[PDB]
Design a protein around this ligand. Structure first.
Ligand SMILES: CCCCCCCCCCCCCC(=O)CSCCNC(=O)CCNC(=O)[C@H](O)C(C)(C)COP(=O)(O)OP(=O)(O)OC[C@H]1O[C@@H](n2cnc3c(N)ncnc32)[C@H](O)[C@@H]1OP(=O)(O)O
Ligand SMILES: Cc1nn(C)c(C)c1Cc1nnc(-c2sc3ccccc3c2OC2CCNCC2)o1
Ligand SMILES: [Cl-]
Ligand SMILES: [Cl-]
Ligand SMILES: [Mg+2]
Length: 384
């Protein structure tokens, strides 16, 4: 019935728009009309302004997400973003502290809910719009289905609107009104035996353990011999190679140089970017971020280390060669599995590179924006 979502400026479940329609649901908004009062929480709970740059506040958010964030369909794996990853995700250029919103239960002083946004320029069907990117919405498991999430969403919308920003982008595995695109995820096994033992992957009578390990074996040599970790000096060249590439898609972020530096310079166990430089020119890039899963109820293993394909561009090799090197560089950095979405050119390499189709998909949404939906090959943004 979507009783909350139907009160919001998003498409109805049946809405379908021509390619010519590309505009807000509600235009001519006025900063001066936005509510100044915080939305009301139930008795005994209060808003909390989180300082993600303080280790202790950042620790509280980490604990909340570690225990209560997203689980796979079978409740065996739960995302386990690290504290340094949350730091990086939330302190991008021109971030606002007041868009990092916690909810505490007054009597324990414990964080029980969270929601965040960062500002990003988003190009949708060739119109660039100042938006908020929303992520890390989470309500403690003990307080589910109490209608707290619409409170968090309405409060962040109010604070975003105070900055004269009236559109947002977000992704969810759940179906809401109404996806602008829908991308399945695929997984390429790296540590086969481990993935079998935790029930991420399976065997069978044809594929014995030894034959499954042989199947996923990779040669420890790069297609692009000079691919190396990105350094500060490469920010200009990355901004030109990526910025040009992305303009073909129907939905992408428009990065400034300061955004390239933030989103790509390598941070161990967070973000890995590699470049191929020729003549002082960046001609190819690979990137992926680290998003481990906590494994629930396995006696031997508690963590699955997973590399998540972010942005990959090649001008000197085939896309298949580039993605093969991405898998190898993930392997060299101790990752058990390489995960990709069917966005950009990704799907075209999944069969040859031995990726397996996963169990669900990620829906891309816009808030207060009406437009034609599109196949995921035309999606040119990867969220965290
Ligand atoms: C202009 C600026 C605009 C800014 C804002 C833009 C929009 C931002 C929107 C947020 C984008 C976040 C993106 C993001 O973070 C990445 S998707 C990750 C979401 N987090 C998790 O799945 C963590 C585990 N789950 C939870 O913590 C709770 O289940 C949550 C908190 C998800 C819902 O808590 P609950 O205790 O289970 O539920 P109630 O409080 O009773 O609330 C039920 C209402 O919530 C609607 N709902 C449920 N899940 C949602 C989801 N993932 N997006 C949006 N809405 C969601 C649901 O359809 C229902 O509305 P309806 O009756 O109409 O159906
Ligand atoms: C696998 C998996 N493990 N777990 C713990 C979950 C809930 C899933 C399902 C899932 N839900 N979102 C995604 C994926 S796969 C992928 C590959 C490359 C880039 C992004 C993603 C992605 O979503 C990202 C970005 C949106 N938030 C979650 C991670 O995967
Ligand atoms: Cl209201
Ligand atoms: Cl482990
Ligand atoms: Mg609730």
């Amino acid at each position: 019935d979507y009783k909350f979502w139907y009160t919001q400026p998003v498409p109805k479940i049946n809405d379908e728009f021509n390619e010519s329609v590309n505009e807000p649901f509600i235009s001519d908004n006025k900063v001066e009309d936005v509510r100044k009062d915080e939305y009301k929480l139930p008795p005994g709970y209060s808003w909390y302004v989180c300082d993600v740059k303080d280790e202790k506040d950042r620790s509280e958010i980490y604990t909340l997400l570690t225990d209560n964030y997203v689980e796979d369909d079978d409740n065996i794996f739960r995302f386990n973003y690290s504290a340094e990853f949350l730091l990086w995700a939330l302190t991008s250029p021109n971030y606002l502290k007041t868009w990092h919103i916690g909810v505490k239960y007054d009597a324990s002083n414990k964080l029980i809910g969270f929601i965040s946004a960062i500002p990003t320029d988003i190009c949708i069907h060739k119109r660039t719009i100042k938006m908020a990117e929303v992520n890390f919405l989470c309500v403690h498991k003990t307080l589910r289905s109490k209608r707290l999430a619409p409170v968090l969403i309405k409060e962040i919308t109010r604070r975003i609107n105070l900055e004269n920003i009236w559109q947002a982008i977000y992704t969810a595995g759940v179906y809401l009104p109404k996806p602008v695109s829908d991308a399945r995820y695929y997984h390429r096994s790296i540590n086969v035996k481990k993935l079998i033992e935790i029930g991420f992957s399976s065997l069978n009578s044809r594929l014995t353990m030894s034959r499954a390990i042989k199947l996923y074996r990779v040669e420890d040599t790069l297609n692009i011999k000079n691919m190396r970790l990105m350094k500060k000096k490469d920010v200009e060249g990355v901004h030109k190679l990526l910025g040009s590439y992305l303009e073909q898609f129907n939905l992408y972020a428009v990065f400034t140089k300061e955004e390239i530096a933030h989103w790509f310079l390598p941070i161990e166990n967070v973000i890995y970017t590699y470049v191929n430089e020729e003549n002082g020119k960046i001609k190819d890039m690979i990137s992926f971020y680290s998003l481990p899963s906590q494994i629930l109820g396995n006696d031997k293993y508690s963590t699955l280390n997973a590399a998540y394909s972010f942005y990959n561009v090649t001008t000197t090799a085939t896309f298949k060669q580039l993605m093969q090197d991405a898998i190898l560089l993930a392997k060299r950095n101790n990752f058990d599995v390489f995960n990709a979405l069917e966005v950009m050119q990704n799907k075209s390499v999944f069969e040859d590179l031995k990726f397996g189709e996963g169990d669900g998909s990620l829906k891309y949404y816009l808030y207060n924006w009406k437009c034609a939906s599109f196949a995921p090959a035309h999606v040119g943004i990867v969220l965290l």
